[PDB]
Amino acid sequence: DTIAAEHKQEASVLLNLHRNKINYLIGETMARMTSLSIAIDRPVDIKKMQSILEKTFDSEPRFSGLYFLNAKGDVTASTTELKTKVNLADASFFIKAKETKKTVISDSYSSRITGQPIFTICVPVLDSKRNVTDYLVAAIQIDYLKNLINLLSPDVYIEVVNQDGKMIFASGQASHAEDQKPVSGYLDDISWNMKVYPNPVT
Amino acid sequence: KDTIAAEHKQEASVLLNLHRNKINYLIGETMARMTSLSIAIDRPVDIKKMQSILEKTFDSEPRFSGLYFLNAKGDVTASTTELKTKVNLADASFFIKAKETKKTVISDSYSSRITGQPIFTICVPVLDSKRNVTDYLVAAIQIDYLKNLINLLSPDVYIEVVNQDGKMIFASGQASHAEDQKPVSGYLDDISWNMKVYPNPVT
């Protein structure tokens, strides 16, 4: 009954290793975007913004894309080469960012631009008068996070789920989890619950 | 029991990673913050606008002793700390290393030439397009702030932070608690600081 105890500890240690890596990713990304939003000289040269987004996005496989929105929510700069004009004024994160005038981290969803699952960090750009003028938007690929976890822990079963039971992603074979209770824990900045299943004793 | 020992040894290995990761994050996030500045600032750099960005950045960030901006010569030309007499940092270890390497540098701990407090600095060279160093972003962080961070979670364990040469960076907790214990220890990612967490003893 006590190889079990060790397997439960190993799980708890994976839980922490893994939340940290993701909490870092998100925290660092917010930090970068916040820097950009402060350092932009007004009025914004859209071409200049574009080159900065490209420099930033280069070599960070984490990013699905990075985008700049006008006050109306039209994508005005984009690391993804667009085939139509895109407007995001209807996305919850947009609406929430506009309202709160605070940074926002969205739930997962399927990218309007790339069609794959992602979640985004949105940072409104403010005025002297504290009006939102523009929005910086970084989108992170969910699958990137899956693989991050899957390469370090292929033989554990780990699922991440949001507050409403939506499956964000799952790593490993669910078989490795049978007769197991999972060790769980929420992330810092999104309300995703990670669940790490102890391995069974042999 | 030996059973309860291995447990406390692990309670401590859990603390090592917890705290290492917290500092590792603190440093990396700060680097990222400065890196993004160098990238997005219009060049050539306007110090008025620079001065304002540093102030905005230093806002709600008890992390910092201060943010500074240096020119190629090492003169502090923007600062979040009200300066009396013109300051130059060309002689600073980290400055020399930064000019040289044209890469980000994380200093060891030392006493602030500016605030007289114990700090360590992150120095990010600002490069022109021909890859020449034109300026330097400098972020100073209070060692105090880090002590508090550890203390906040584990005020009842003994944690020692020491550099590659045996210099005490800081200690958190009462050393009484370390008696008869071997520490679970490990180095940070971006500074050569070795963190040592001493298991709690048995009831």
Side-chain angles (χ1 to χ4, degrees), chain A residues 2-202, chain B residues 2 4-203:
Chain A
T2 132
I3 289 201
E6 303 168 352
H7 279 216
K8 179 165 174 174
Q9 201 182 58
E10 294 160 54
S12 228
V13 158
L14 280 189
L15 170 61
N16 288 352
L17 178 80
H18 291 304
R19 291 141 102 206
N20 168 75
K21 192 96 219 314
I22 296 182
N23 286 329
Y24 179 87
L25 209 109
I26 295 169
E28 195 200 63
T29 297
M30 290 164 59
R32 291 193 174 289
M33 299 298 93
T34 286
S35 281
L36 308 191
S37 87
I38 286 176
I40 352 189
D41 212 346
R42 190 116 202 270
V44 215
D45 199 313
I46 242 53
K47 293 227 203 286
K48 163 90 161 140
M49 240 312 114
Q50 176 81 24
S51 61
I52 286 167
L53 292 188
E54 286 155 13
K55 293 171 190 139
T56 299
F57 173 87
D58 263 321
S59 268
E60 322 299 288
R62 33 165 144 273
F63 296 135
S64 172
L66 306 175
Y67 310 94
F68 196 61
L69 314 189
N70 58 23
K72 265 118 120 161
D74 302 339
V75 170
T76 66
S78 162
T79 60
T80 298
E81 185 227 85
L82 297 177
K83 262 86 185 221
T84 85
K85 146 155 160 296
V86 181
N87 181 284
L88 302 175
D90 52 312
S92 332
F93 77 76
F94 184 97
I95 290 148
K96 185 189 176 188
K98 186 174 176 72
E99 181 120 23
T100 64
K101 299 179 182 172
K102 283 193 181 310
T103 291
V104 165
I105 308 94
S106 75
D107 199 5
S108 77
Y109 70 88
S110 203
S111 168
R112 241 206 285 287
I113 292 141
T114 82
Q116 302 157 313
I118 63 161
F119 71 110
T120 78
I121 290 135
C122 184
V123 178
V125 187
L126 301 186
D127 233 333
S128 341
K129 286 175 148 279
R130 274 195 90 248
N131 312 293
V132 186
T133 67
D134 297 275
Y135 301 85
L136 281 165
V137 180
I140 286 157
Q141 238 158 6
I142 297 294
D143 325 276
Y144 169 89
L145 306 186
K146 187 183 174 164
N147 303 336
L148 222 41
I149 303 205
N150 193 46
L151 295 193
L152 274 154
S153 302
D155 297 322
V156 187
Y157 181 62
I158 293 163
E159 63 189 21
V160 185
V161 167
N162 74 15
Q163 61 300 310
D164 293 344
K166 189 181 64 187
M167 173 82 55
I168 309 306
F169 70 81
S171 172
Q173 318 309 310
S175 46
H176 287 92
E178 289 163 352
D179 224 271
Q180 310 307 324
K181 245 167 284 281
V183 201
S184 289
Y186 278 86
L187 279 44
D188 287 347
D189 291 308
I190 350 187
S191 47
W192 288 349
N193 192 28
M194 173 175 300
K195 295 169 156 166
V196 179
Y197 285 90
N199 276 324
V201 348
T202 60
Chain B
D2 286 85
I4 200 65
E7 234 136 77
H8 291 5
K9 168 160 187 177
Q10 235 57 342
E11 247 154 61
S13 199
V14 160
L15 276 207
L16 185 59
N17 304 321
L18 238 270
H19 291 289
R20 256 158 131 202
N21 280 338
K22 186 68 211 279
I23 290 164
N24 283 332
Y25 172 92
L26 200 173
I27 288 162
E29 187 222 65
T30 309
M31 283 159 73
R33 220 141 213 162
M34 322 265 66
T35 300
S36 291
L37 287 196
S38 40
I39 283 191
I41 200 40
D42 275 305
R43 331 270 179 95
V45 179
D46 193 87
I47 29 68
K48 300 293 170 193
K49 272 146 190 182
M50 187 47 83
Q51 179 65 36
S52 183
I53 285 160
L54 294 189
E55 290 159 4
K56 296 206 176 74
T57 291
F58 188 80
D59 279 0
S60 286
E61 292 299 54
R63 326 184 180 280
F64 306 112
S65 173
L67 302 183
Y68 312 103
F69 186 74
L70 272 42
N71 62 27
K73 180 177 151 48
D75 298 336
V76 173
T77 54
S79 143
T80 57
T81 296
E82 172 201 12
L83 305 188
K84 289 180 182 184
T85 132
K86 24 139 193 292
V87 177
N88 175 289
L89 317 178
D91 51 286
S93 3
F94 68 78
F95 182 96
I96 282 132
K97 186 180 169 182
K99 190 204 193 81
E100 170 55 35
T101 65
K102 306 214 215 112
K103 303 274 141 163
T104 293
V105 168
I106 318 283
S107 82
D108 196 352
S109 69
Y110 70 92
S111 228
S112 174
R113 185 175 318 186
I114 303 174
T115 58
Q117 298 312 311
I119 64 172
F120 71 109
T121 86
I122 303 182
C123 177
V124 167
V126 176
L127 307 197
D128 74 20
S129 51
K130 302 217 187 122
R131 294 261 318 172
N132 303 322
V133 187
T134 53
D135 300 276
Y136 300 86
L137 283 156
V138 166
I141 306 175
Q142 245 137 0
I143 265 61
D144 208 47
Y145 180 76
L146 309 177
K147 196 194 316 176
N148 303 346
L149 288 188
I150 313 296
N151 238 325
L152 206 65
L153 296 209
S154 324
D156 293 307
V157 203
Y158 187 66
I159 310 269
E160 211 171 50
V161 184
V162 149
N163 80 2
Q164 75 294 331
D165 293 323
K167 195 182 76 173
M168 183 70 83
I169 307 303
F170 69 76
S172 176
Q174 269 307 308
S176 330
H177 300 16
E179 309 195 354
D180 232 54
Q181 312 308 325
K182 266 134 309 201
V184 178
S185 74
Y187 274 82
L188 272 37
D189 287 346
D190 296 309
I191 349 160
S192 55
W193 289 352
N194 191 8
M195 183 181 288
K196 298 183 187 172
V197 184
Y198 286 87
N200 265 359
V202 186
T203 125

